[PDB]
Amino acid sequence: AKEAVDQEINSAREELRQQVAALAVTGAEKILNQQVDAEAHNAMLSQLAAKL
Amino acid sequence: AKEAVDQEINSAREELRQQVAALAVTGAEKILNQQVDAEAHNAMLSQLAAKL
Amino acid sequence: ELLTLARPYAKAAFAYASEQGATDNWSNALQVLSAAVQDEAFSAYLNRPELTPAEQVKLFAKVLGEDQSQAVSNFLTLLADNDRLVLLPEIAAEYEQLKSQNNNNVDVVIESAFPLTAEQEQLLKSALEKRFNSTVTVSVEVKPELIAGVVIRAGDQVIDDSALNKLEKMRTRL
Amino acid sequence: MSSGRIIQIIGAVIDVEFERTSVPKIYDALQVDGTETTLEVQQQLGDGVVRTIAMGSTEGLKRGLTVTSTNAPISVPVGTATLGRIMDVLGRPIDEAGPVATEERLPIHRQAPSYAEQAASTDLLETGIKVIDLLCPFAKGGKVGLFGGAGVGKTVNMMELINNIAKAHSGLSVFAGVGERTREGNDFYHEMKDSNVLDKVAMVYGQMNEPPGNRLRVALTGLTMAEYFRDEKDENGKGRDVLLFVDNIYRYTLAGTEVSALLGRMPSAVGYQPTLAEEMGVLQERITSTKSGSITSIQAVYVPADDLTDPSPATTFAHLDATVVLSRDIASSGIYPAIDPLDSTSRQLDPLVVGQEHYEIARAVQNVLQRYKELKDIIAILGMDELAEEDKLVVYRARKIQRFFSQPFHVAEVFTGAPGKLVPLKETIRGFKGLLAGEYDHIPEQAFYMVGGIDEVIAKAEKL
Amino acid sequence: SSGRIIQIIGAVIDVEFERTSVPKIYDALQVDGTETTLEVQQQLGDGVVRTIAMGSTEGLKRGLTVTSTNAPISVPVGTATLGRIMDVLGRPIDEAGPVATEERLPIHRQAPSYAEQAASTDLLETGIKVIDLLCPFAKGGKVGLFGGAGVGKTVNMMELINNIAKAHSGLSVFAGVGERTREGNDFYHEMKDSNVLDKVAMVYGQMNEPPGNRLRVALTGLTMAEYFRDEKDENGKGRDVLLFVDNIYRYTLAGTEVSALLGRMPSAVGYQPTLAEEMGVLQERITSTKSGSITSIQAVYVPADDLTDPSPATTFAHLDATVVLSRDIASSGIYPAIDPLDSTSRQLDPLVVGQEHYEIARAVQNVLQRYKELKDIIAILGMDELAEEDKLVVYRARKIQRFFSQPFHVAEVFTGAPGKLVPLKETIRGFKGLLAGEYDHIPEQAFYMVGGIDEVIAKAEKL
Amino acid sequence: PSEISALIKQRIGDLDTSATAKNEGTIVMVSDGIVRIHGLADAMYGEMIEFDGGLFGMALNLEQDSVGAVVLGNYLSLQEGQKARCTGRVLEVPVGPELLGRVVDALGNPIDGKGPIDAKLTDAVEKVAPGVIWRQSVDQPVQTGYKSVDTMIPVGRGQRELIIGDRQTGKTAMAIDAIIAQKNSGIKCVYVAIGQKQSTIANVVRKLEETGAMAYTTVVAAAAADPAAMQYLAPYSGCTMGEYFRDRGEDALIIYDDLSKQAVAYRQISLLLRRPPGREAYPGDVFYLHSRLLERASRVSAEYVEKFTNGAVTGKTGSLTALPIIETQAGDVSAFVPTNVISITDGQIFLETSLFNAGIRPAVNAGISVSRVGGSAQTKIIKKLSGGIRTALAQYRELAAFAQFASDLDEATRKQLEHGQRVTELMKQKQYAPYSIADQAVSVYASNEGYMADVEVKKIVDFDAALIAYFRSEYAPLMKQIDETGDYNKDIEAAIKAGIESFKATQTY
Amino acid sequence: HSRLLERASRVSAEYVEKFTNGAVTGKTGSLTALPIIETQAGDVSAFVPTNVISITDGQIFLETSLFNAGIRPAVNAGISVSRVGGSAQTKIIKKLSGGIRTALAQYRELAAFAQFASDLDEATRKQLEHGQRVTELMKQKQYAPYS
Amino acid sequence: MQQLNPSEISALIKQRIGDLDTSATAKNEGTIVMVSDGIVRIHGLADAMYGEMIEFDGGLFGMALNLEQDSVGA
Ligand SMILES: Nc1ncnc2c1ncn2[C@@H]1O[C@H](COP(=O)(O)OP(=O)(O)OP(=O)(O)O)[C@@H](O)[C@H]1O
Ligand SMILES: [Mg+2]
């Protein structure tokens, strides 16, 4: 049962990977919250990091 | 046995987050590297001086 | 260690020069002799075993030119006697420390990714004045490999705005 | 202006700097500013640099921190109120029953007693225990070697000693716990309390949970306490004569080795501090009597590794005057105390000390007890009735002797009823002499057991 | 940015570097003149480092440039090393041409984690009387061989080698550690004539090289064993592999040699304080795992037959059996010549070996030790004056000693090289019968130089 | 899914809230987990230190110009130039009853693969023993399931008692079995393992799990593959966890492993600090080192409990019993470290190699093993019944030489010899087979009643086991009551003797 | 000492043959050496003795009192051995040495009772007498070797 | 290098800075430097003799033990 559930959960982590890829590109703007929003727009322009 | 199963589930659940965060930070590094704003340099040093 | 050995000599030299106000002259001499001992050639010539303390002393006087003093000569003599010539630059450094603290000046070292403008530098000097020091000695440094920001070191005291913040976020996520 | 600042810290040793115009002397006291820890000058390192030890934990401390001095060695409270009080080495209460009442303070150190003050006489302390009182009489201002394992009533014997000295000779009692284990210390406290004797003793413990300096200096602490009490004069002068109880002086020597090692100094033959004899003596010479008052010492002694030729016991015997040993078998034979009346040795065992007749009597007793001891094996193996009837008489008489040397204790009164009996010499002497004469060979051994003087013995015998 | 020779004293070496460029520990340093290599031991500040020379200590010139690799010591591994003998550096020393593989792995991995211990203890049988009865093994165990100089110990190891090889595809490996190269060559050739090298890998440290090399041969063998165990074959579980230590004591001594020159202060015997650290580092990487296991055999030397000092003391806290060889039992003509009364294992336990085998071992211990203590009085008077009791005991003990005589499978010339490898169960049967007395009516000679009851009875009937 | 994404973002926005003005240092020198660093003028003594690689370090030598500190994690990752940083804090580890059923690092970090631990409380590892005024006497016993142990060597809650012996003598087994007997004691227990083969560690773990007692139990191990400093500090951490419950008014038990080994580690560490060595390279404070540890465990005065709780709890008194272990070279006691140890414990127990070699399981030599706490650490009934064993074993051990003798000697000697031989054999015992105090009680009664003074020696153990089962079945309520109370009463002994004589009358052994 | 004695051994004929570059083919090279270690009070635990023993092929030992017992030479066979064994002996001497070694072992076994030949076994007495005779057989003069 | 001479004292160094010779009245009076356990290292007495008694401002006496290049132990 462990093998079955772990393999299928693993199989469910790739759509989640692409999801969280979008969501981490989204979180990548929180470097703007790192600053005082001295930059608040440098990231929306950038989408070159479309990796995995 | 059941507790072992649960622990394995939790291990995977936490593990995925690590590679996700690594990808996110690599993207953030790329974005900051493409960022060439010495204007932000001036703004943030002024900001610190204000905090000083 | 080596600094520990150098300590008392620095104390003596500082006390005397302050008592004679020639502190600047001794500091200049210290820089001169530090550069001198840095030279491999000069040292190797100096460490030649056929030379009594007098030889090394007069050699230092010569390389110093018309800048030495009788106190300078005595100091050189005493150090040659115990052969402590080697650790001279550390003595000089501590001597600088003593003058800075004595005049209550603090020397501050700042590294920025991008080069700086005197406006910002004066602003920071004022800011550290609000940090309640007497006076400040600013030495800037361009460090574009650092992502951005200015890092400021006052001895053990450090303040950061550069990549370190990011390192902190990653360790936080983990 | 005495504020100096920490310069270097390793383990327990501590280094500070001061001004080269005002430098504390060795053994001065340093209180850390803002904290309750104290520093002790050991050796002047020149340049206003001093190397010292700390008194307790050393945590959190950081260099450049200001510390003041006292320009004087350590002083602690002393006075009448010090009884029934447990303080640290610093003379600070740990009983948690308020501060110390006295304002009288004296420095811990002082030079050795003057040669002029050594009393030109040497006499004996009276005790009512009927055993040392014959075999190993104590001098006045002597050192008593004590040996044997725990569980044989060491505390009990100390109880009785204290009771007697305070009762007859009005002695005052001081006890020092060197390298103490807390549990037995607390038990000893509760015993001090139940047996109504606490009000007459001054108590200080150094635990084996403390840096060595604590353990080293509790000794001098208690010593000074005793000195103050003795030199405290009575009416018409003549301050009291007091007894001092100290545990495991061997632990003291060990702690001395500790601090010597921490100073980075080479070991000794076995590895003790090379200066061992120095501190041993410094302890000793302040233990004596004077033209005014007297001091006597009881010291628990442990021999590690059973080496009578080890340097530490060897140095001990250099000052020992009387030896008392405690038995396991004798106590198991229901005889209390279990003092072996055959190994105890007294420097005072001389016809010039106890007198002629007393000396000869004691020697005769020793002979009888020996003679019976070698008789024992033959009695065991080859029966009993195969020997000289005189030897059998010896057997009976020695058995009576052993039955007799034990006695009730006034401290035993609260323990198991049976109030104790105080007995001086000149009756013990007479009774024992008569026993040696064999004039009591018509009586069972029972009349001698758990009883006082020979008059009591005959009273019981008639009543038995 | 290359360092230079700045000071050399015997076995300790120092190099200057540009303070920005500093080598890390345990990474190889390339002598720019010769093939000799240096390992970092500690960083001395200012771009100054302390190192030990892997290779010759000749040709050295103060102020000779040296480069690094900026990476730990890695040597090739894999099936392309079996039957080949390598140096400490993994180079062909057998003149059989270069190694075939490029699979190179470092040598300073960490000890296997706690969570990955083999979750159950195991057992190993050898088909050998005294051992499988009195010296049980756990697969992944630690075995010590103490003493023995009138017999061929290497013969014994080679017998175990044939044991495991025929018993399992699990290969074998030996490391020369202060090797008495006479015996090493003998072992090499005898394994050669056995035609069994495909399951064997060879690295030698032979008392002729700087102490670091003889230190590190152990790590080399460890690494080979690790990787070879990790090759999961067709199932997800690789073979359980066997190791041979030429001598653990020489491993200790290798570090012991230059410790003081390293600036290390002496220890309780003058030793190296890092003794226990390196010891544990060595042992903890030798265990049984969730997938696969590794065990080893350690040829032990004892200084003056004294065990009461740290050098064997630390070792003992890691073994699982103390096989102590016997000389006069060899004088009794016994082939294995192993003492039956001193050797033990922590594995003697009913829960792990069952009850019957354990209690048989108990009884045989008792009978042998009781027979020993009667030797004196028997000599004084004779068997007759003893009660009829223990006469059968004497006979049974003698027959036990005969039963232990096991003809060797691989000597090639000792009795014809006959293998026995008798099952543990059959030997249990035989010793049970002997303890009961089922055959306490036969001359002990019938029990000599044989195996099970079948052989004993056949011999007794033929004579 | 998206859950963590929100979680990570919301957590992040909580940081970089300001810029720190911290004071830190940098690396100057490295050797074998030992680092000389420059800077950090202000520094707590013994401050725990952080480093750029995420590791940590312990500062010991505060010299006038630099700092020496020992690696806590795994070095071989650090190079001069990297910057240190103090935490503004002292070494601290977590505690909490949730630690039961959990196995952690000496730093208190899970190793059981059971994920994070929710310890609500952490505490500094280094503290001081409470005031001696906050000590009250010891009267509650501690059971071992070992008739010899529980008879001649009573053990009271809060007492320091030492197991000692030579090597491979079951000392580990003695500790663990003592642990097992705590099904009903209600106390908790902590095992401290030092420099051990993870195989052995895991075997102990598995065995304990089989017993299931790893539920009121917590264990930490500094195996042989660990940084020396970790090992050095670990026992102090275990003491910290014990003191947690002790100060909660609770009573518990803890066990060390190879205090000698951690002493060795400390020796090595100190040596690498260029400190002045002592005899056998041992810095003197080893005495101080151990002693400041052992005394931290005791039974406390309930008044201390009450005042610490500030009214939270008022009835009970806290306690903690200390069971350390020392391994010896050829049974010496004169070695420096054991010599130091001896004067510290409240009692000591020796293990003799020959007895176990003679198959005497266990192999305790009662002849020298003592417990100076007296019967106060026994139950009333055992307090009553110990003396017979005491004196019989005495007489035997003086005169056991006559084994082969007494073919012409007097009969009384023969009878006493048989008595002694039987009672000596009586204590032979197997691991993992603790005896309830009722079992011990029936055995001692049968002993002193001489009802085994008529049966052959070879079957004494069988006799005992049969008796055990017989009562256990027939008279369960009686033993129930007994171990409920542990009181000696004439009714009780009459019932026991009736059962015994029934057993003899009934089924044979 | 290691790198010293290590140099002493016997080589393969091939090795030298190629070393001589084929100048010699048949013979093989060999070299035996004998070091001497002096003992203090006959102690064996001494550092240098410990090392050298750990290195050598085996021990050859001599006891003072045996030389004082007239045993010249005074070999102590109880401890001196060679790992080489009969492999370096000819057929006949290996064939013979067995019972000799056995008798020596027997005599050494009964040493503690050697002073009580009045109550022992007769066969034990015979073994002792044989050991005595062979012991005396092991005497030899100096400069007088035997074929 | 090696440890400091227990004679290199900022006071003494500054004095030699002022002038090297004529130290302490041609070394007729000595000043104490190092103190431990009745053992005293002193600077500035060359007129002093080995094995000489040494007077003190404390009114006490000292025993000459080590005449050295820079200092004296007593
Ligand atoms: N009463 C007993 N009955 C049967 N077996 C026992 C008994 N007591 C101990 N043993 C066995 O003895 C073995 C060795 O004991 P143990 O390993 O505890 O010794 P040790 O001193 O802890 O070893 P080390 O010194 O290596 O730590 C254990 O595996 C255990 O199974
Ligand atoms: Mg153990």
Q: Give the residue from F264, F267, F258 showing the smallest Cα distance to F193.
A: F258
- The residue in chain F having the minimum alpha-carbon distance to the alpha carbon of residue A19 is F2
Give the start-end residues of each E strand in F136-245.
162-165, 188-194, 217-222
Select from A19, A27, A34 the Cβ nearest to the Cβ of F9.
Answer: A27
DSSP code, position F73 = S
d(CA B7, nearest CA chain F) in Å: 6
Spatial distance between the Cα atoms of C15 and F356, rounded to a whole number of angstroms: 76
3-state secondary structure chain C: CHHHHHHHHHHHHHHHHHHHCCHHHHHHHHHHHHHHHHCHHHHHHHCCCCCCHHHHHHHHHHHHCCCCCHHHHHHHHHHHHHCHHHHHHHHHHHHHHHHHHHCCEEEEEEEECCCCCHHHHHHHHHHHHHCCCCEEEEEEEECCCCCCCEEEEECCEEECCCCHHHHHHHHHHC
Torsion of CA F173, F179, F180, F184, to 10 degrees: 160
Catalytic one among D40, D143, D160, D180? Answer: D180
Spatial distance between the Cα atoms of F27 and F68, rounded to a whole number of angstroms: 10
In residues, how long is chain H? 74
F168 assigned to a ligand binding site = yes
Do the Cβ atoms of B51 and F18 come within 8 Å? yes
Pocket, ligand 1, Cβ cutoff 6 A: E 317, 346, 349; F 167-173, 327, 361-362, 429-431
Spatial distance between the Cα atoms of F255 and F22, rounded to a whole number of angstroms: 41
Residue type, E256: T
Spatial distance between the Cα atoms of D422 and D129, rounded to a whole number of angstroms: 7
* C-alpha dist (Å) from residue D359 to A10, D85, D352, D356, F382: 100, 42, 8, 5, 50
In sequence order, the β-bridge partners of residue H54 are H62
Ligand nearest to the CA of F257: 2
Spatial distance between the Cα atoms of F246 and F321, rounded to a whole number of angstroms: 10
Distance F353 CA to ligand 2 centre (A): 15
Q: Give the residue from E121, F372, F47, E190 showing the smallest Cα distance to D150.
A: F372
Do the Cβ atoms of E181 and G54 come within 8 Å? no
Nearest C-alpha to atom 3 of ligand 1 is from which residue?
Answer: F430
Do the Cβ atoms of E276 and F265 come within 8 Å? yes
3-state secondary structure chain H: CCCCCCCCCHHHHHHHHHCCCCCHHHHCCCEEEEEECCEEEEECCCCCCCCCEEECCCCCEEECCEECCCEEEC
- Neighbouring CB atoms inside 10 A of D388's CB total 8
- Neighbouring CB atoms inside 10 A of D312's CB total 22
Burial class (CB in 10 A: 0-12, 13-18, 19+), C134: exposed
Q: Please tell me if residue F325 touches chain E, with a CB cutoff of 8 Å.
A: no
Note whether D327 and D402 are within 8 A (CB): no
In sequence order, the β-bridge partners of residue E8 are E13
Spatial distance between the Cα atoms of E133 and E434, rounded to a whole number of angstroms: 14
- Report the binding-site residues of D for ATP: 148-155
Angle value at C-alpha F393, between F391 and F397, nearest 5 degrees: 120
Nearest C-alpha to atom 31 of ligand 1 is from which residue?
Answer: E349
Domain ranges of chain E: 1-72, 73-347, 348-463
Do the Cβ atoms of C123 and B46 come within 8 Å? yes
- The domain in which residue H55 lies consists of 3-74
Do the Cβ atoms of F45 and D58 come within 8 Å? yes
E153 assigned to a ligand binding site = yes
Query: What CATH number is attached to the domain comprising C14?
Result: 1.10.520.20
Maximum C-alpha span of chain H: 39
Note whether F227 and F74 are within 8 A (CB): yes
- The residue in chain B having the minimum alpha-carbon distance to the alpha carbon of residue F114 is B7
Are β-strands F370-371 and H31-36 bridged in parallel, bridged antiparallel, or unpaired?
unpaired
- The domain in which residue C41 lies consists of 2-100
Domain count, chain H: 1
Helices G122-137, G91-109: inter-axial angle, 10-degree rounding: 130
Select from F4, F19, F115 the Cβ nearest to the Cβ of B48.
Answer: F19
Chain F residues within an 8 Å CB radius of A26: 5, 9
Maximum C-alpha span of chain E: 89
Shortest-distance atom of ligand 1 to CA F351: 21
Touching pair B, A by Cβ (3+ pairs < 8 Å) = yes
**What are the residues whose beta carbon lies below 5 Å from ligand 2 (ion)?**
F 172
Chain D residues within an 8 Å CB radius of F133: 86, 94-96, 186
Ligand nearest to the CA of E317: 1
Do the Cβ atoms of F12 and A30 come within 8 Å? yes
Q: Token digits for D47?
A: 């340049």
Q: Does F362 sit behind a cis peptide bond, omega within 30 degrees of 0 on the bond before it?
A: yes
- Neighbouring CB atoms inside 10 A of F480's CB total 11
Spatial distance between the Cα atoms of D179 and D218, rounded to a whole number of angstroms: 10
Which residues of C have a CB under 8 Å from any CB of B?
112-114, 120, 123-124, 127-128, 130-131, 147-150, 159, 161, 166, 169-170, 173-174
Residue identified by tokens 């085998």 is E357
Angle value at C-alpha E376, between E374 and E380, nearest 5 degrees: 115
Residue identified by tokens 């004539």 is E193
- Ligand 1: residue of F164, F323, F353, F431 to mutate (most ligand atoms within 8 A of CB) is F431
In sequence order, the β-bridge partners of residue F30 are E43, F35
Note whether F66 and D7 are within 8 A (CB): no
Q: Is D403 a catalytic residue?
A: no
- Ligand 1: residue of F144, F168, F196, F255 to mutate (most ligand atoms within 8 A of CB) is F168
Spatial distance between the Cα atoms of D422 and D169, rounded to a whole number of angstroms: 13
Q: Give the chains touching E; criterion: ≥3 Cβ pairs < 8 Å.
A: F, G
- Ligand 1: residue of F361, F364, F435 to mutate (most ligand atoms within 8 A of CB) is F361
Domains, chain F, ranges and CATH? 1-92 (2.40.30.20), 93-385 (3.40.50.300), 389-505 (1.20.150.20)
d(CA F25, nearest CA chain B) in Å: 23
DSSP code, position D117 = G
Note whether E455 and E403 are within 8 A (CB): no
Touching pair F, D by Cβ (3+ pairs < 8 Å) = yes
- The residue in chain H having the minimum alpha-carbon distance to the alpha carbon of residue C4 is H4
E148 assigned to a ligand binding site = yes
Ligand nearest to the CA of F191: 2
Spatial distance between the Cα atoms of C123 and C107, rounded to a whole number of angstroms: 16
Distance E319 CA to ligand 1 centre (A): 14
Select from C130, C131, C148 the Cβ nearest to the Cβ of B44.
Answer: C148
Are β-strands E85-86 and E202-205 bridged in parallel, bridged antiparallel, or unpaired?
parallel
If you write DSSP's letter for every residue of F370-382 in order, what string do you get? EETTGGGGS-HHH
Spatial distance between the Cα atoms of E130 and F489, rounded to a whole number of angstroms: 55
Q: Spell out the residues 6+ positions from residue F369 whose beta carbon is closer than 8 angstroms to its own.
A: F152, F153, F348, F349, F350
Angle value at C-alpha B36, between B35 and B41, nearest 5 degrees: 100
